[PDB]
């Protein structure tokens, strides 16, 4: 129940404001900047502010914080969802999120803001559907918004029917400084770029453990996805009944399902690092990386971030494979490896100086983060079984899908 | 299928070597199609196995079945899930329709000795589907 959604700037200037209910005066935005400064300077800064009887709940974007005023006990989750939808719509319409487009695309921005939410209740949020009613360069609204199918515009015709899938894996490992991994979860990401003619009803079928058990094939490699988050086009009832993944794919790239299950296997990369930091004299980095992944897979663009001293200077790197560069902006040693064959072992011996005078305050121990991304590797073992592309007219589809394995929250706790 | 014919003798030898009773990861061949075996493909594979021999009358074993499924997947891209047998005790029918292979007793269903036997009626009669309609949907 937001009262007025406004877009601010980095200097406190409101780039654009659009009141929806008017229950909050527009002058209350002036106290938002001082309130945010006080909260940040006292550690009380939060995404949801409070200017007396009016709360300013908003998030910070690339260049501005979208503050949406509210007065009643409105759904903060609803406000956050509306803000996320607005950010996605702006990103779809404008390739960049900065003040350069706010002051240049106001004509279409105002129309989009007026059409998106009325009286604090959003009604239309599909960027592809919204692009047919509001343009920056007006006919009747499309029937898709009024119709039940608001994610598949009718009348789409293409020369070919090719759908590109992307099974993106995120290897997140929370390894403590003692050497034990605490948070080791892998979240699947099935992003598909459907480009066909018409409104096909996709019939997704994979090697799920639950599906195999129900059908009686619970003996082969089946993915035990703890959480499966279907998209809007996917029918929740069909999945709830017999794990039937039936949905109408949209035109473009979108996320259909997002698997998320815990991981109990060995890490793909094992890093053994040592810290021979002398007391204001020198420092040693005996870092050894062991690739526990399969030898048939190669981790393209391996970036193991090793946090070096903040005041360290005159560093020397004695490694084996991969480019080692120290970034003063990040204050860490970037163990950059182009191609890392599975089972490879890289040994590094760091040596950097340190000032004699001790630092005034402690800087902490940032964790070591690996940026390995090995494509064509399905760690979870989940394989797509079939994709029932059915169209009323009748056509032969050519679906495609690729599996990409990367490291997510794969950080290693420092000692 | 020259590749299938070549792999049939080695596969049969490996199955015979394994008694009736190391690397991590799940690599995927680049551009190799992966899909469940079709009924026609299953019937053709059963006919080829019957013609070549080594599968009819062979003692059923988990290791031999896994090796055969892996070889079939490598040589054809068929998912190793269509080579399932109906639960015992007694004769186990193939789970996938069209398969001509079935398990029959040779003497708890787990300790019962089973042997692979060709069955042409399996490709025409859905014995597994009829026995377990819930498993077939």
């Amino acid at each position: 129940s937001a009262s007025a959604v406004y877009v601010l700037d980095l200097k406190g200037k409101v780039l654009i404001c659009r009141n929806y209910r008017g229950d909050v005066d527009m002058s209350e935005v002036e106290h938002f900047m001082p309130i945010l400064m006080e909260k940040e300077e006292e550690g009380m800064l939060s995404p949801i502010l409070a200017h007396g009887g009016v709360r300013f709940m908003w998030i910070k974007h690339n260049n501005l914080y979208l503050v949406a005023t509210s007065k009643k006990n409105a759904c903060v989750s609803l406000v956050f969802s509306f803000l996320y939808k607005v950010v996605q719509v702006f990103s779809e319409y404008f390739k960049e999120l900065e003040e350069e487009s706010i002051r240049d695309n106001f004509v279409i921005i105002y129309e989009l803001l007026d059409e998106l939410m009325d009286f604090g209740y959003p009604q239309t949020t599909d960027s592809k559907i919204l692009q047919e009613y509001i343009t920056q360069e007006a006919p009747r609204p499309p029937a898709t918004v009024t119709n039940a199918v608001s994610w598949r515009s009718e009348g789409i015709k293409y020369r070919k029917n090719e759908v590109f899938l992307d099974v993106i894996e995120a290897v997140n490992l929370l390894v403590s400084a003692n050497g034990n991994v605490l948070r080791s979860e892998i979240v699947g990401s099935i992003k598909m770029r459907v480009f066909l003619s018409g409104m096909p009803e996709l019939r997704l079928g994979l090697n799920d453990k639950v599906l195999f058990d129900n059908t009686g094939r619970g003996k082969s490699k089946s993915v035990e996805l703890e959480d499966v988050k279907f998209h809007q086009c996917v029918r929740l009832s069909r999945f709830e009944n017999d794990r039937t993944i039936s949905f109408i794919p949209p035109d473009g790239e979108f996320e259909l399902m997002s698997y998320r299950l815990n991981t109990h296997v060995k890490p793909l990369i094992w890093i053994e690092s040592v810290i021979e930091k002398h007391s204001h004299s020198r420092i040693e980095y005996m870092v050894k990386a062991k690739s526990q992944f399969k030898r048939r897979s190669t981790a393209n663009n391996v970036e193991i971030h090793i946090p070096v001293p903040n005041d360290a200077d005159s560093p020397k790197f004695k490694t084996t494979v991969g480019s080692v560069k120290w970034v003063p902006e990040n204050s860490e040693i970037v163990w950059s490896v182009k191609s890392f064959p599975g089972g490879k072992e890289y040994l590094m011996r760091a040596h950097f100086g340190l000032p004699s005078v001790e630092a005034e305050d402690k800087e902490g121990k940032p964790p070591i983060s690996v940026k390995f991304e090995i494509p064509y590797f399905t760690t979870s073992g989940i394989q797509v079984r079939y994709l029932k592309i059915i169209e009323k007219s009748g056509y032969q589809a050519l679906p495609w899908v690729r599996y990409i394995t990367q490291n997510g929250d794969y950080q290693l706790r420092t000692q | 299928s020259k590749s299938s014919v070549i792999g049939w003798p080695a596969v049969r030898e490996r199955m015979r070597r394994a008694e009736p009773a190391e690397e991590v990861g799940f690599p995927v061949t680049p551009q190799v199609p992966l899909r469940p075996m079709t009924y026609k493909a299953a019937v053709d594979l059963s006919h080829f196995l019957k013609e070549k021999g080594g599968l009819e009358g062979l003692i059923h074993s988990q290791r031999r079945q896994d090796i055969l499924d892996l070889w079939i997947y490598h040589t054809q891209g068929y998912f190793p899930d269509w080579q399932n047998y109906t639960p015992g005790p007694g004769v186990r029918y193939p789970l996938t329709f069209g398969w001509c292979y079935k398990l029959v007793p040779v003497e708890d269903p787990e300790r019962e000795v089973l042997e692979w036997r060709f069955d042409s009626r399996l490709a025409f009669h859905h014995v597994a589907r009829e026995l377990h309609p819930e498993y077939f949907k």
């Binding site: 495609w400 599996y403 | 469940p36 077939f136 949907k137």
Partner: peptide
């Protein structure tokens, strides 16, 4: 080609499950 794994064709359904 494409970085992150070459795209592979997908099936239509579980042919072995009827």
């Amino acid at each position: 080609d494409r970085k992150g794994g070459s795209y592979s064709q997908a099936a239509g359904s579980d042919s072995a499950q009827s």
